[PDB]
């Protein structure tokens, strides 16, 4: 879809796609902040669309 408001170096990426595509990165960051206690629990959180905060 056209994004006239984008800078030349930019694109619009659906947050749903970005989650799966960066999933490993997202797990490590979640553990480092505290949004979950260990990486394997964080993956359980993203598995049901409702459990996602």
């Amino acid at each position: 879809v056209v994004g006239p408001q984008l800078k030349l170096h930019q694109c619009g990426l659906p947050k749903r796609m970005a989650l799966e595509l960066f999933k490993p990165f997202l797990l490590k960051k979640m553990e480092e902040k505290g949004i979950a206690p260990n990486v394997k629990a964080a993956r359980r959180m993203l598995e049901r669309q409702r459990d996602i905060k």
Binding site: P37, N38, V39, K40, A41, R43, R44
Partner: protein, 83 residues
């Protein structure tokens, strides 16, 4: 898969965190009983022929390990999600 190889290599890591806090012979009766060494579960009978003990010091040797490891849980709370 990568996720499985990941968790299987993180379960062994967070488990040999328990071979320490226990000891050397405690953290070995568990290896024979649960089959970490041979693959088969050796009863407190066969195990008696590797330390000399009979089928009731092995039980306390085992239950001292598990009960101690059970207190190392709820303080590290690592192994819960590992299902």
């Amino acid at each position: 898969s990568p996720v499985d190889a990941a968790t299987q290599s993180l379960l062994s890591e967070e488990l040999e965190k328990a071979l320490s806090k226990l000891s050397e012979r405690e953290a070995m009766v568990l290896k024979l009983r649960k089959g970490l060494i041979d693959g088969r579960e050796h009863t407190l009978e066969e195990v008696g022929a590797f330390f000399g003990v009979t089928r009731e010091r092995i039980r306390q040797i085992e239950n001292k390990a598990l009960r101690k490891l059970k207190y190392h849980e709820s303080r590290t709370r690592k192994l819960r999600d590992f299902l």
